Amino acid sequence: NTKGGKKGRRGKNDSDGPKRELIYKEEGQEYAQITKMLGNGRVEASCFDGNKRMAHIRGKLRKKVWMGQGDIILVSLRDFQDDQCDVVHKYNLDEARTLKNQGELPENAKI
Amino acid sequence: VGLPYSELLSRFFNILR
Amino acid sequence: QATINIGTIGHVAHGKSTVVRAISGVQTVRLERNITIKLGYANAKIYKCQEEISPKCQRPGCPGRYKLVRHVSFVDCPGHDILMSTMLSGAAVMDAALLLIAGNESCPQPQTSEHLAAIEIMKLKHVIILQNKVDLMREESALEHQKSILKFIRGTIADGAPIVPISAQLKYNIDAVNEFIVKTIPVPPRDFMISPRLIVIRSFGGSILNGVFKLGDEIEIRPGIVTIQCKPIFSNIVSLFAEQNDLKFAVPGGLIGRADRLVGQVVGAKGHLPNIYTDIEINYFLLRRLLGVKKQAKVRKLEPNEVLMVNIGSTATGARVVAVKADMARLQLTSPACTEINEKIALSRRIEKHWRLIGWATIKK
Amino acid sequence: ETATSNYIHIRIQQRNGRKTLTTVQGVPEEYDLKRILKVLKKDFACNGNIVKDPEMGEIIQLQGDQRAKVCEFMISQLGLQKKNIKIHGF
RNA sequence: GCGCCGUGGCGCAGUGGAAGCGCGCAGGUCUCAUAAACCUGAUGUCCUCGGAUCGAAACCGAGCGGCGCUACCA
Ligand SMILES: [Mg+2]
């Protein structure tokens, strides 16, 4: 079971596990809380840095991993542009908590 | 006139816990 | 019945009411989450060990029942920057005062000053400054404050207004305070023969100033209830009480006795000659600064058609300026003022939402 | 004198699908209810329904998950205050 | 101090044996799934404590909190 059982979910197979290794920060890539989940693949997500941004879903997670409101997310910022940016990796709740404990992200937002 | 007072300050201080 | 009326002015939470509690025992009830809101009230007996507070000398030295000097009364004002309008009111009953400064906060604090100058303005010249919270300070701190005090108390009218540091919390040093107030706040003579006249500041209550009332006299209240006009109320003194004990008569110094309606009203002899004015001739003067707030901005001269709080006697009335001369303005009032004599008044302006004492003068008829 | 802060309860009520419902409890009875409902309907994609309680209380229904958005809208259009709101559920 | 609400959680109501309604949370059932639609709840006896009377949260008291009356009661 993934979302709603279905006749049309057995033709997919998801492989990641709940016990997966947490992904760290990169260059031109940082952490965001989701302000409001917008339509058509767009999403309003406030970064942990201090900029408002406009986040966008790029492939991969577009159907595989569903997302909600107020989630800690990996965003690779546009190197040429700035206002439009893209989501790369969704973080789990446990994962988020671990990150918070570590102090890798700034302590400003709650899960 | 401070003497009278300075006195007063003394006498209270010496009544503390 | 109490001889005299001593006021306890000062900034907020410096403990004015608390000092009143170490001296009398009484609390002002409280307000219970806030602080004193009505004028508090309390009395006490002062005797002395020739050889005190209760007929008992065997507390120091020994027994010989201390000799009774007088019985006094206090008037606990509030301290909050906005209860200004009542404290003013209250002063009208005082025969003297005690300025409670806090030993652990920046000496000239807004209200401390506001009060002080109100005092030197109205006429209450028999003053005792008191350094309160010395039970929570460095033996240096309370002396340096005594300095800033001894220096403020300079150019001002306050020569040797002594300064008795206390501990209102552990009731320490209070007896030297009783000795101050037994020296400097002497009990004024009052010709009784005079017209029976008194100020009201509660009712469920007020202070006499000149004359004397007796059980079963015929009396009136001014301006009295309104219609828009304002007519006097007549009644018979059903009874007379000070503190909890009943008396047959009542004389100045003290307070005697729904919500507090006839607040700011006065009581006199029935069939007596007193003006119930709507419009009044003030002679007047200003402060150069607005000493009170926690900013000293320089007092703007009076513009006509301005609304100002006219504090007359115990009453607190609002009024508009019809005339603007050098020191004689003519004021039109919402609620009448019964002018019993010639008199004192205190004049305020809504500076920044909250009202502020700005200048004074004398009523004129 | 009137109380400035009253407990307005915006609750989680489960609607058709994974979707929810903005239900308002403890509504101030000063303005016209029907008018407010109409306004709400106009502003969003919601339908307004009022469940009546005896003496005090009216349950005000708005289909959907908005909460914050709804509050913002209320702030924009005079009738309700900023401090009165409470989110109930999760 | 009076009056009502005194919970099994919130918000509404009823007083002498009967677990009262609307919502919420916690969980289930039904459907491939969620919701609607359904049941079961939780400190076991509906303030704290005990009694008159087998009993009861309801009758009575001492003892608390929120507001409907009061205005600071020397
Ligand atoms: Mg397969």
Side-chain angles (χ1 to χ4, degrees), chain D residues 12-86:
Chain D
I12 299 178
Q13 190 154 115
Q14 292 175 116
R15 257 287 186 274
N16 297 57
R18 292 169 78 182
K19 302 161 181 180
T20 48
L21 205 174
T22 35
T23 19
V24 183
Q25 271 202 120
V27 187
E29 286 179 58
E30 280 82 63
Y31 266 88
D32 204 290
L33 38 139
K34 198 181 181 180
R35 288 205 290 104
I36 69 150
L37 288 174
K38 282 173 86 180
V39 165
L40 287 161
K41 287 177 208 176
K42 284 180 180 180
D43 290 319
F44 277 104
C46 307
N47 191 55
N49 312 306
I50 289 181
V51 183
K52 295 99 178 181
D53 299 65
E55 286 183 56
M56 267 78 178
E58 274 189 312
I59 306 150
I60 296 189
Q61 294 174 251
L62 285 92
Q63 316 158 316
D65 36 75
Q66 312 89 3
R67 320 266 153 75
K69 286 96 166 285
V70 157
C71 292
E72 283 173 61
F73 266 84
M74 112 209 287
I75 287 154
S76 79
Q77 296 290 307
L78 285 154
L80 278 136
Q81 218 187 108
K82 308 165 194 175
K83 298 164 188 177
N84 290 49
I85 53 146
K86 272 268 96 181

Side-chain angles (χ1 to χ4, degrees), chain A residues 10-13:
Chain A
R10 38 95 78 67
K12 199 181 185 182
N13 205 63

